[PDB]
Structures are given as structure tokens and as C-alpha cells.
Amino acid sequence: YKPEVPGNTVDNWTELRASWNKERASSLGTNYYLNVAVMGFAYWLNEAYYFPPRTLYVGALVFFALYVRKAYFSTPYAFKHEY
């Protein structure tokens, strides 16, 4: 016995193709912007190490809850001709 793949093959393969019909950007922009963000604004966290631990833990959970994943990322703005 083997389980059946759910769905239709044409519809599943169109789902697999979606949002990838675009040339991928080079990674130099992401890396340069990350380095600029760290070298310019990471000193804002110097006093944060002394803040109460409930605040630090809730802030860490908030950063995890609002994080957007870089892999498999897509925007509807990539395929529209006006804002």
C-alpha cells in the first residue's frame, strides 16, 4: 500500500511554478544592507542588556512572531504594473 498524492497534477504543478517566473537578484544588496544595519544601529541595544527579563523575553517572542522568512518569499508587487 502507498498513499495517494492529494490534488490534481496540473493544479499542483501550477502551484509549484507560481511566483518564480522572475530573474533572481544578486545577494550583494542583502549583504551590504545587513552590514550597514549592524554597523550603524546595533549600538542601540547596549543598554538593553540591563533591562528586566520579562521585557527581553517578550521582545524576543515579538521579533520571532513578526519575522518574515527569506526563503520562498514572494510579493504581489513583483507582477503588477502600478502601485
Partner 1 sequence: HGPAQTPTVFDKLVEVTVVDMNGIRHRVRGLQGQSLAQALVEYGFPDTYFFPNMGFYTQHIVDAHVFVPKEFWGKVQNVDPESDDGLAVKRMFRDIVQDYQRDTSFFASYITLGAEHNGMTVGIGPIKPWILHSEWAFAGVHDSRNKQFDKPTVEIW
Partner 2 sequence: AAAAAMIELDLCFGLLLLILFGLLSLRNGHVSLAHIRFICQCWLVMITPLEVQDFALCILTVVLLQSFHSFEALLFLLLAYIGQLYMMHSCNLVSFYVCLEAQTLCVVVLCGLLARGASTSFSVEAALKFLLLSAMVSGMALFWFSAMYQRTGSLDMVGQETFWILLVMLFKLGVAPMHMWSVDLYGSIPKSLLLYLSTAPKLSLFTFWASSWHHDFSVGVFILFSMFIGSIGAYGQPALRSLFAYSTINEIGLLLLAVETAGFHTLYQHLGIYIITQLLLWNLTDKRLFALCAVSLAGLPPFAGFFGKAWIFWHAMSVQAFSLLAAALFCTLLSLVYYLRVIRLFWTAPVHTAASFTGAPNQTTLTSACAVALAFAPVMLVKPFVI
Partner 3 sequence: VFSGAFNTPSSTTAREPYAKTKSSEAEYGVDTPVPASALKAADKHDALAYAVANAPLIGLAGLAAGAQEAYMTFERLPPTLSRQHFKQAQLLLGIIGKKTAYATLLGAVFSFTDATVENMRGKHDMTSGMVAGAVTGFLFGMGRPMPQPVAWPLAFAGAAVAADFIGELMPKYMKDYRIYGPVVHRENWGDPVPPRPPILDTGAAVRPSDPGQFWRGY
**Identified binder of ligand CDL from the candidate list 41, 49, 77, 83, rule CB under 6 A:** 41
Q: Does 68 contact partner 3 by CB under 8 A?
A: yes
CA distance 80 to 77: 5
Nearer to ligand CDL, 63 or 77 (CB): 63
Q: Does 64 contact ligand CDL by CB under 6 A?
A: yes
Q: What CA–CA distances, in Å, run from 15 to 24, 48, 60, 69, 78? A: 19, 44, 34, 19, 17
Q: Does 16 contact partner 2 by CB under 8 A?
A: no
